[PDB]
Structures are given as structure tokens and as C-alpha cells.
RNA sequence: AAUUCCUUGUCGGGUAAGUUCCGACCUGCACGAAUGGCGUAAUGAUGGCCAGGCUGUCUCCACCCGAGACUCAGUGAAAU
RNA sequence: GCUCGCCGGAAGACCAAGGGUUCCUGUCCAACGUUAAUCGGGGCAGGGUGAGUCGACCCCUAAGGCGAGGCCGAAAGGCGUAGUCGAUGGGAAACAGGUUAAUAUUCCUGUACUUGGUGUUACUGCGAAGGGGGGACGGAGAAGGCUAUGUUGGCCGGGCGACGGUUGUCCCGGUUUAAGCGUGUAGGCUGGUUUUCCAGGCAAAUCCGGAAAAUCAAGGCUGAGGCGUGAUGACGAGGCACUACGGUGCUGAAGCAACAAAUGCCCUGCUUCCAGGAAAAGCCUCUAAGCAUCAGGUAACAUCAAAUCGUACCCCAAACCGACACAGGUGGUCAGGUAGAGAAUACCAAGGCGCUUGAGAGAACUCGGGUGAAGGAACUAGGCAAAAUGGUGCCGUAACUUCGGGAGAAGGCACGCUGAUAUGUAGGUGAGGUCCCUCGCGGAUGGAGCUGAAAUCAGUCGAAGAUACCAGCUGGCUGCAACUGUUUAUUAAAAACACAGCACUGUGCAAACACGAAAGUGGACGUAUACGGUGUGACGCCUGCCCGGUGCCGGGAGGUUAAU
RNA sequence: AGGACCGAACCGACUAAUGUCGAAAAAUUAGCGGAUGACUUGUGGCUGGGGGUGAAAGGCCAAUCAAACCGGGAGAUAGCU
């Protein structure tokens, strides 16, 4: 039974990585929101 | 030549093949090749804009010289080659100056034939001349919309146009659709008919043949649900509706030409 | 103590119509 | 804590 | 009839016995010619019926080999 | 430690992805382990990952992403040129042996190779984002030459043996050696050389292309394997001396031949087929600007440099994805013996395991199996499930048919072992010798030796010889769909969908149409033998009547009719 | 030669039994279909919610689909319990 999550570091970084968020303004707002909440992990860091 | 293959197995019973013995059995001319990446019917937005396109064999692009601007240079037909991008075969022609080029092959070409371009050219098939110098009533192909554009009419296998009249600086042509169009006399055209006239006699035989030609299955509107197509819905093959396109436009006899710009160049319409 | 994150989906064995 | 160096080490088959 | 309410239409074939199946008639409630009509070799994990072989499917169950069930020691749930 | 059992195209050995110390040693048993636990992928401490050649990095690019200017858009922003990113692809180079409790193609020994900087010597025109070549490519099929590897014989070392026999054509083990360098073969491809000329290769060109002549008939390119060196080295059964008794040290014979043989190499080859089968750089080559006492390039030698990052361990699993130490899922490579057509199947080698609760008893009943008197579908909605058939060769094989099929139709006959034909045949392979040689990896005669089907006759054993595993039930009528195919992941695999074919209809190319406030893109680098939509659904006979109503196409007599 | 035939790997899921607080939030055992192609598969891309994709079932779009998920309007409204 193949499950939904099939890990891949390259796909994870290129999809939800820090640079991916900064590319668009919506991603920048995502980072801004999580800085405000004080989350330790801003994004998925390798 | 048209060959009917024996029904050794289902999928071969209805296959009719077209074999051209004089086609070149080898790789094409590399310098005139270019990559042709498939699209699958998607546009720059990534959405499907044309349906039933996708898959198929990889095919490279041959730079076919439609403009034919090499005026005054005699050329010799090296060989004929199969072009995956076109219904008509192409011909590799070597000019007296050492330049090779690809041109559409009319019905009469064969290896070693002589062709010439420019106004100072003969009347044999394969020569390109301005339509002013072409005698009225002759058959031409690869006709130009505008001087230097390149050539857009009668490009498929076994196609041609008739020159019916010449008034002033404009010429009237009868297209394969039965429509009469008025074109500038400065436009070039190629004498003769496009070759491979038997290309229409193939039948492909089975479903896979159309599949690896780049065509995907077509689903009828009735088979779909109401939310997907204007047709569809109901139990037991109910239609009860006027035929329409998937986007609501009424097909089956509704004229969709709305240009008002090129109408001045149209003398008669299709009948 | 903890709400089961998954709730099994049942079936209707008996139409009872 | 987080390791960030998943470099490839392919031993010759 | 993948279409037929009355209906298990009527007659014949197949069975000792056939509301199914096959053939024929037409009184076609309410078939019908590209939302196609009638045939069609081959093909089908397709629907129905019949025959030979084969058998615990069954008349009617009997014994046997293993894993549980049972007892002892350890660990130790659940719906309600 | 000795037996027993299981996997052995894996339940073995390797990776990639993904994990992130699970690796090794010491120590501890609280919790964790579906039980105990001295044990552990558990706790604590310590140790462990060594590269010019592997990979990443780096040079180049595909799909695609971003995108200076630019075009477009209320704003946000969309698209896109030049560019710049993007491996799942192309691009220089190392093998063998040894060693650690844990790393090695990284460490050590031996023998190699690649790309650059600097310096010396002898020659010389060098010089690009520019030109040309090359890189550079499909499917299927067949043969030949090979090798990995295997089997047997010879050789070397050991054995002759607790139940009869076994110094013999008997038994056991070993019989291994790379990259590189030199030679150039089987095979494949292409005719070379010289001279002259040409608006072609967005400029030029000695390069490519083209046109002329003279000349020879060969040359050139590619190329597995083999053979020498590498290597009087390493490895090597076994023997001997000590064991913190786990192991350490020393020594070390033979190391050949024949046969069979790949899915691997020659082969990105060859022969055929239509669906006609990436790009760019590295590399070679020609020149423009510029400099030609320079600089630079070529050849040889010396020296220097090759950084940084990954290197443990699991990787069909207890370590990855499934909440679990979960009967599930997970891409690639190696893949031996006997029988076999075979990577099926049975039993085994190397290697790895007995799946983390056990011990008893031997009730009903449940689950998975075995057998069964007589009958043989009487069971049941229904032959559901079971049972049965099952291989090879020969004979034989109906209706119907699109002439291909149906068909393995149906239905019969023989299958073991031993001997003879024939102290193993036909066939395959092929040593030594002999004769030639455009002379070495050469050509004929020759058959040593090795390998080895298939068939006939005779004999013989059993109830049974396709003896186990493996391995079609068959035939008749009939509805639907032509067929292969696709579909409700997780109750529906079908008559549904698709399909080749057929017809109608739209579309003249700034095409119709579609996605987009727009630019623009797809259609298509195609253009009516083309493209879109719609219905029908191979093939054969065909497809009748009706234009009232609603659509669609054309008309304009007349009437009505908005903004203004 | 073949959307050819038999049959492993591989892909799929026609029948039966077991299992339904299971070993498993669709599996196992015995049979079964395709298996050179309209095939299958690794890696990386593109299509985004009245939208995508769909050999068309209202199927699929992170175990959720006749309109996904998250936050907000929001303490929506509820003549109902």
C-alpha cells in the first residue's frame, strides 16, 4: 500500500523551502506570519 | 503504392499502407534539422487549449524553405525524404553554389530533376515564379499571401490551386475548398501539384495507429454528465437537445467567420 | 482523553426499506 | 540539532 | 426480444417432469432503419441453456493430520 | 559446541532515494522489547567516516523556472527578449593484494594514469560569443566472434577409513592473479592522393560544401577477445609454534589443458520496418578585429598544484513510507550446482536465518489440509467450491469463415532402466605432424582428444515409467459488443467508455476554437489529402416518408421597432 | 512482421474462503487477466477549487470531493432538539 507521503529532500526544499517562500509576496506573508507567532522553524530547513 | 496487408491477426485486417520505394532509406540532412518539443495541447498558462493532443512518436523539425528566395541559381534534386511534420514528402535540393535546402516535393519530381526560381524560370513543375508571370489557368501550389511571406496555400499532399482570372495588380485563385480568393500578383507560387496524392488512401487500421500519431481518444458529449457537457445526462441515451460545442456554441451548421477585414479579398464562399 | 483522530466510516448492511 | 548536509556518497557498484 | 403488463402467448425440440433455453407464428399494450436496422468469422476473468468426464456439492456424513479453542506459568486489552 | 529445520532470481551480497549514529567497544536492566532477559536497533560513557582518479562541487544543456530593458494590466501583478538557473542526460584520469573491534578502489605495499601553472631547449604565425566537423541518439530481428562463468581430465597435497567392500578407471581440497603498457586480430565503415576554380556557410577563410580535370587502386578510421609485459611479485590447500584460549606469528607444493557457454562485450554495429527516432559544451579544425624583435602555439624534460563537501550503519527492512520491532509498499546492479526450454519448479553451494511468549492435554466447534464404501449434481438462485484435465513426438482433426482462422478442435498411439547397432552414432569442436606463405593472431590436408542428441532391435523391473514439483476440462445452441484496450483507488470490469472506419458541420491562415480584463500562448513553426466540433462505431446488405413546431442557412415586398 | 499465441519478472484485480474491537483505515491464501505494447517504471517538471484533469465513473485532485484543505467574515442563521 503506497502511502501519500513519499519523502524527497529536493522536492521538499524546492516546494516549501525558504527561497521558495521569498519568491512570491504570498510566501513572504507566510514567513511574516510565522515570525509574528514566534515559531522556531520558519520553514522546512534541510 | 497502396498495399493491403493480410489479416494475420486483428488490427491488421483493415490496415492499408502507403509505401514509397523512392523515399530515402537513411538519416536526414543534419544541418537543416531542429528539435520539436511536443506540447500536449497546453499553452503558456499550462491549461489544455486544444483537446485530443498528446503522446506520439518523437519527431524532429526539418527547416523547409517556403520563401524560395534563391533567384537565378539552378538547383538539382538530390533525393526525396519522409517528413514526419507534413503529409507531403520533402525534397533535398542542392544548388549550383553548394547550398542544400528542403522544399515541398510536387507530383513530378524525381532524383536528379532540375528546378529554378525567380521570374526568369521555366514552366516545368517545381519552379517558383511571381503569379504575374504564371499563365492563367495553370495549377500552382505553395502560394504566398503577401510578397515575401513564404507560402501558405496548397501545402498538403495532393493539393493545388487554379488561377482563374487576373485583373489589374490582383489575381483570383480557386482553392481546394471551392473558395475564390483575390491575391496580389507580386506573390510567388510553385508550379505543379503537391506530391504524395495517395496519402489520403491510408486507414491506419487499429486504435494504436492513431495513438502514436499524436491523437488522443475523443469522448462523446452524450457519454458525459450534465456538469461536464451541454449534452449528457438522463437514463438510456437521451439527447433532446440541439447539437452544440462543449462551450455552448451551436455547431452543425452555424457560421463562425467574423473577420470583416479580409472580406474584401473573398469573391465567393464555400458551397 | 484524546479524541480519535480517525472515525471509521460504516456501511448500511440492512436497507430496512 | 538539524543536520543540513545530505551529500551523496555512491560506492562504485 | 436487454423491448411483452395480460403471459408460464400458441405449437414443436430437449427432460419421467422445463415460469429457463432453442426453433416457428404475429394478437408488435409500447421494434425500426447513423440517439442507426438486420446478419457476421474471430475475440470475451461477458448473460442464459444443454451434454460427456469428474467429483463429499449432496443422499449422509466418518476418520485422520496440523493451527486455535481447554489446563498451567508470564504479560495483559476492548466495545458496554 | 554438536545435531535438526527454513530461504537460496533470496529470507544472500550491493547501492540510489529516505533515515541520521541505529555502526564498534565497555558497562547497567528502571522504562522500552506484546513473556523472562545476564541479551538488544534500550540507558550511560568512550571510540569510529582519511580520495588528484568514487560521487558531489564544477563546464554544458532538456522539460521547465526566473527574467535587465520591453509589452500588458485598477493596485497586487501577467507574459516574455537578451541573459541566467535547471540531471533524471553529455564532459579528464586506478587497479590488485594486505590491514582495524568498527573506514578503505580513501590507509599501507606494488605497479599506473589524467588535467592545469611555472621554468628550460628546438621550431613555429597566433588569435573569438564567428564558420564547419564531431559530440549525435528509434523499434524489432538474426548470425558470427568472444568473455564472465561452469563441468571434466591432468597436476599438486592429504586419505584408505568405527556396519560388508575399497591402493584403485577410488575419495577429499586446491589448481587464482587486475588496471596500465606493447602488438594488432574476428568484425564494421568509407575509395584515396594532387591541382584549378566557385555570387554558398548573415564579414573573411588554407576549413566545410560544390564543379572540373591527372593519378593509383589501395589507403584510412573503428574494433571485442587473444597473446607478451605487469608478475623469478602477490595469493595459495596444508603444515608448525603460542593462545588474555577470541586469535597471532612462521612456512608454503601445483597453479595447466579440453569442452560447454550467456540476457554481458565487439554492437551508439549489421539487416529490415514506419510511428522517422534530444540539446549544448568538452574535443578537432578555419579565419575577422589585434599583434607579428613580442605575445601565443606545437614538441621534449624538470618542478609544482588538483582545493572544498559526502565517506559509519540500515537500505524488499525491526533503521525508509504505513501512529507499532505492523503478514503491506519501495528504483537499480551481481546472481553458482543437479534435473529443466527456462530468472518457472524441486533439492542444494556461498551466505543468512528458525520470524521475542512458552509448557501440557489431544473435548465440542472454527480455520487450513488428507482419504473414503455404493450413488454421481439427486446440492444450490447458479456445478459456488472442490474434483478432474495438464508435458513431448507421431497419426488425426468438424460446422462455419473476412481464407488469416476455427485448432492445442475433438479423438488415438509410445514414453523407465540395461545392452547392441556404435569398446557412444549423426553432429559440434579440433591438438600434433605434413605442404604453402601477399610470414603471422595466416591458408589447405589431417584427425588425436573432448563433447554429444535422436532413432531402431533385444532384454528387464513395478499395480502404475509425462512416476515427484511443475503442468488446458472438453463439446453443442444462443443474447450483447467487432477485435487488443480503458473505467467507479476502498462493494459495480460490464452490454458501459474508447476504438479504426463512416457521415454532417465549421474553419482561407492575424483560421475556426480554447486559456487569458489585456499582452500573449496553444491550434501550428501546421494551413483544406489540414485543423476543430458533433453523432455513429470494424466488415457485408443497406439506411425509407415527413420542413408543420424548434434550431441552422438565404431573402427581401410590407409592417413593428432603441439610442440619437 | 504482429495493439499475434503460451508463460515468469513486472502491471492489474474476475471468483472463493479467511479476516471485520483484523497482521492490514481493502490485506492474506488458492486460482485468475495482460505480459513488444493504446505497455510498464525511476527522476524532474506543468495544469489550483466553480478551477484542474478525466478512453467519462460525477471518477480523481495528500486515507477527506455533486465543488479539496487552512485562516478569516463568525458567537453566520436555526419558528428545531
Numbering used by the authors:
A (entry chain 2): 1 to 46
B (entry chain C): 1 to 271
C (entry chain z): 2 to 18
D (entry chain x): 4 to 16
Text from the published report:
To our surprise, Api88 showed a less defined density within the PET despite higher binding affinity and higher global resolution of the cryo-EM map. Most notably, the local density of Api88 was more defined in the C-terminal region and branching of the local density in the central segment, close to the previously modeled Api137 residues Arg10-Arg12, and indicated the presence of two conformations, one forming an upward (‘up’) arc and the other forming a downward (‘down’) arc. Tentative modeling based on residues unambiguously assigned to the density resulted in at least three geometrically possible conformations, referred to as conformations I-III. Modeling of the remaining peptide chain revealed the possibility of two complementary conformations adopting a down (conformation I) and an up conformation (conformation II). The shifted Arg17 side chain in conformation I resulted in a twist of the remaining chain, leaning closer to the lower PET compared to Api137, which was most pronounced for residues Pro11-Pro16. In conformations I and II of Api88, Arg17 is involved in a stacking interaction with U2504, leaving the side chain in the correct position. Apparently, C-terminal and central interactions of Api88 rely on 23S rRNA contacts, mostly via stacking of solvent-facing nucleobases (U2504 in conformation I and II, G2505 in conformation I, U2586 in conformation III, and A2062 in conformation II and III). The C-terminally amidated Api88 showed vastly different conformations compared to Api137, which might be largely due to the loss of the negative charge of the C-terminus leading to different electrostatic interactions within the PET. Upon further investigation, we identified a third binding site for Api88, but not for Api137, located deep within domain III of the 23S rRNA with parts of the Api88 density highly resolved. The Coulomb potentials suggest electrostatic interactions between the positively charged peptide and the negatively charged rRNA backbone as a main driving force of this binding event. Taken together, the central Pro9-Arg10-Pro11-Arg12 motif appears to be the main determinant for stable positioning of Api88 between helices H51 and H49, rather than stacking interactions.
